[PDB]
Design a protein around this ligand. Structure first.
Ligand code: 99O
Length: 127
């Protein structure tokens, strides 16, 4: 049983930007989702060993989680907001791939994803 290396959160050769939308995504969107009662399963990479889900990383080849996204934001890892939004979408999509409609984990993702879409519907305009 082995978890893979988690996604990178630092990369000096990546071009980085401190964007008004990216600050919003950390200060407002991520930190609001982070406090939700259903956020805890998404706050770190899936530990397929602890959770005894040995087939998780057989199926999920681009893992993502809100703890990785929080580190990426706090270390100024993104060039623009769409890169950060795509990591959220990967995280939600992975959960819907590995799991089935009706699963408790999928009810949690569906709630988080609707809040997430509410919060990003309006981003501060690129000043
Ligand atoms: C989001 C990443 N991710 C999955 O794809 C997934 C599949 C099955 C279980 C599980 C758990 S759990 O065992 O802690 N638990 C959490 C609360 C609701 C259910 O009871 C399951 C935590 C995080 C998970 C899973």
């Amino acid at each position: 049983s082995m978890n893979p290396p988690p996604p990178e959160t630092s990369n000096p050769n990546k071009p980085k930007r401190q964007t008004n939308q990216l600050q919003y995504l950390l200060r407002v969107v991520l930190k609001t989702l982070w406090k939700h009662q259903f956020a805890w399963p998404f706050q770190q990479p899936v530990d397929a060993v602890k959770l005894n889900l040995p087939d998780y990383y057989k199926i999920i080849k681009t893992p993502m989680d809100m703890g990785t996204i929080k580190k990426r934001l706090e270390n100024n890892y993104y060039w623009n907001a769409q890169e950060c939004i795509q990591d959220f979408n990967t995280m939600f999509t992975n959960c819907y791939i590995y799991n089935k409609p009706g699963d408790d984990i999928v009810l949690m993702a569906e709630a988080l994803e609707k809040l997430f879409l509410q919060k990003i519907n309006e981003l501060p305009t690129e000043e």
